[PDB]
Amino acid sequence: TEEGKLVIWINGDKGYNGLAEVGKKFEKDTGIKVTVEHPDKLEEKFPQVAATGDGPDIIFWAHDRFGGYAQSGLLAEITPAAAFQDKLYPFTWDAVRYNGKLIAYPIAVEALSLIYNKDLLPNPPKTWEEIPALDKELKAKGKSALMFNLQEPYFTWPLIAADGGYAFKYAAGKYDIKDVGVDNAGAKAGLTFLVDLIKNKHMNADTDYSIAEHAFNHGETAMTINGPWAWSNIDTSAVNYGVTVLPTFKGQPSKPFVGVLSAGINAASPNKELAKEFLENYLLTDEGLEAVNKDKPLGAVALKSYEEELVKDPRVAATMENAQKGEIMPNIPQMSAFWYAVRTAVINAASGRQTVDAALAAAQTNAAADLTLVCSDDKSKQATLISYPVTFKGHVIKDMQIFCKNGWMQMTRGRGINMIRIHYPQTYTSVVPGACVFRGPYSVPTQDSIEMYTVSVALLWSDGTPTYESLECYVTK
Numbered sequence: 443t444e445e446g447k448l449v450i451w452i453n454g455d456k457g458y459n460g461l462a463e464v465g466k467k468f469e470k471d472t473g474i475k476v477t478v479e480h481p482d483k484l485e486e487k488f489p490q491v492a493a494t495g496d497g498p499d500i501i502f503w504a505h506d507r508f509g510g511y512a513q514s515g516l517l518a519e520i521t522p523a524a525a526f527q528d529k530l531y532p533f534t535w536d537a538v539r540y541n542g543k544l545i546a547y548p549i550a551v552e553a554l555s556l557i558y559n560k561d562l563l564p565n566p567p568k569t570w571e572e573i574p575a576l577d578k579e580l581k582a583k584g585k586s587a588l589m590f591n592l593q594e595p596y597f598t599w600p601l602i603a604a605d606g607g608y609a610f611k612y613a614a615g616k617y618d619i620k621d622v623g624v625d626n627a628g629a630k631a632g633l634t635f636l637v638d639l640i641k642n643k644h645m646n647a648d649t650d651y652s653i654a655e656h657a658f659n660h661g662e663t664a665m666t667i668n669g670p671w672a673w674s675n676i677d678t679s680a681v682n683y684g685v686t687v688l689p690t691f692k693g694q695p696s697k698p699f700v701g702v703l704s705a706g707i708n709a710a711s712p713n714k715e716l717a718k719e720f721l722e723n724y725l726l727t728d729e730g731l732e733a734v735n736k737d738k739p740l741g742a743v744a745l746k747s748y749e750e751e752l753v754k755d756p757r758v759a760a761t762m763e764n765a766q767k768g769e770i771m772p773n774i775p776q777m778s779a780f781w782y783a784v785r786t787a788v789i790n791a792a793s794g795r796q797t798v799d800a801a802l803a804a805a806q807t808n809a810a811a812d813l814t815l816v817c818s819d820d821k822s823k824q825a826t827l828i829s830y831p832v833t834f835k836g837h838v839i840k841d842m843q844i845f846c847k848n849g850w851m852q853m854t855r856g857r858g859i860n861m862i863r864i865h866y867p868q869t870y871t872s873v874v875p876g877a878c879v880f881r882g883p884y885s886v887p888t889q890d891s892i893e894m895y896t897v898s899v900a901l902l903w904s905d906g907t908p909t910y911e912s913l914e915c916y917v918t919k
C-alpha cells in the first residue's frame with residue numbers, strides 16, 4: 443500500500459461520508475490525503491487482499507470478523523494509552539479483544555430493532571405470531587405487514603434465537619467451539635415460523651436489503667427490521683417511523699446478535715502511526731463521531747462523552763433495549779463458518795430448496811465441523827464432501843474419521859481444502875477401489891417421494907473429546 447496516505451474501507455450501509463469529512467479535516471491539518479472506499483462484500487475481500495500485503499490501511503467492520511482476521515495475522519496490535527482507553531466503554535474494548543490483545547478500535551454498538559410506520563400502524567404488534575393476521579388486514583388496503591432482508595442471516599437470527607437457537611455456547615469466560623446451537627428445537631421452531639410466513643405469502647423469499655428498504659421508505663409495508671444506520675434514509679422519506687422492541691416469539695424475546703462497529707489496522711500498512719493518530723485524535727472525538735453519526739446513525743457509540751448525549755435519542759434507547767435482550771457476537775474465527783452455514787440454510791428453507799430440519803442439520807454440521815456436502819439430484823452424478831477448516835488455534839478437530847457403508851476412512855484437517863467423493867449405492871462406480879458409499883436410501887415419513895442417504899463422521903478434538911456428526915442427501919425417487 444502507498445506510504446504517506448491513508449486508505450479506509452467501510453461498508454456501504456455506513457456513515458462513509460461523515461468519515462470522509464473527518465478524512466478531509468485530517469488531510470487539511472496534516473496534509474495527508476485520506477481516501478474512503480466502500481467495496482461490495484468487503485468482509486470477504488479484506489482478508490484476501492490483506493494476505494497479499496495489499497488493501498486499505500484501516501478496515502471498518504463489526505467485531506465478529508476480526509478474530510478471523512487476527513488469527514491469520516492481518517491486523518496490527520492496538521496499544522492505546524490508558525487515558526484514551528478511558529474515553530471508551532470497557533465493554534466495547536472487550537469486544538475487540540482477541541487472545542488477550544486489542545486488535546481494533548471500538549466505535550459503536552449495533553443491534554436490530556423493529557421499525558414501524560406510525561401513520562399506518564400506531565400500535566405495532568408485540569409478537570411474531572400476530573404478523574399474519576395483521577398482514578391480511580393490510581393486504582386488503584394495498585399494503586403489507588413486514589418486509590426485511592432475508593438474504594443475510596443476521597436479520598433472521600433474532601427469530602431463530604428467540605426459542606433457544608445459539609451460535610456457540612458461552613461457558614464462564616470462554617466460548618465452546620464444540621457446542622453449536624443451530625440444530626436445536628428452538629432454531630427449528632423459529633425458522634419454521636419464518637418459512638410458514640413465506641408459505642402463506644405474508645413475505646417473499648427473494649426480499650433483500652434494497653427491496654425492504656424501498657418498500658418501507660415508500661410506505662408500501664408497515665414494518666421492517668434494521669439497524670441504526672438505516673434511520674437517516676427513513677428521515678429522508680415521508681414516513682413517520684417508530685423504533686421499538688423486536689416482536690416476541692413463543693412468549694420469548696427476539697435475540698439479536700449485538701455488533702460492535704470496529705476499526706482495524708492492516709498489518710501490512712506502513713502508515714500505522716498515522717492511522718492511530720487519525721482514529722484516536724480525529725475519528726474518535728465528539729466532532730468525528732458527530733459527523734459520522736449525522737451521516738448514518740451509529741447506534742450507541744463507544745465514546746462516553748457523546749453517548750451521554752445520545753442516550754436522549756429514543757431510537758438509541760430502543761437499540762440498547764433490543765441489545766440487552768440479545769447476545770454479543772463471538773469474535774472467534776469459527777463465526778465465519780457459522781455465518782456461511784446459517785445463510786445457506788435460511789435461503790434454502792425460505793426458497794423451498796430444503797426442509798427446515800435438513801437445512802438446519804446441514805448448517806449445524808457445517809458450522810461445527812467445517813463440513814459441506816454437495817448433493818446431486820442425479821444419483822449417477824456422485825456427491826462431494828468438503829472440509830474447509832477456519833479455526834487453527836485452541837480447541838480444534840485433530841482427527842476426522844468418515845464412516846461409509848463400506849468402511850472407515852481418515853481425512854486430514856490441515857489449512858487448505860480437502861474434498862472426497864461420496865457415492866450412492868447401486869451406481870456403476872458404487873463399488874470401486876477407494877470409493878466411499880452412502881448409507882441409504884431411508885424412507886422420509888413426511889414425503890413419500892424422497893429418499894435419504896447419509897454418512898457419519900467421528901471427530902477427535904485436540905483435548906481428546908470425541909464428537910459425532912452426520913451428513914445427509916435427499917433425492918427424488
Ligand SMILES: OC[C@H]1O[C@H](O[C@H]2[C@H](O)[C@@H](O)[C@@H](O)O[C@@H]2CO)[C@H](O)[C@@H](O)[C@@H]1O
Pocket residue numbers: 453455485504505506507552594595596597701781
Ligand atoms: O449476515 C451475516 C453478517 O452479519 C453481520 O453483518 C452485519 C453487520 O454487522 C452490520 O453492521 C450491517 O452492515 O449488516 C450486516 C449484515 O448485512 C456480521 O457482522 C457479519 O460477519 C455476517 O457476515
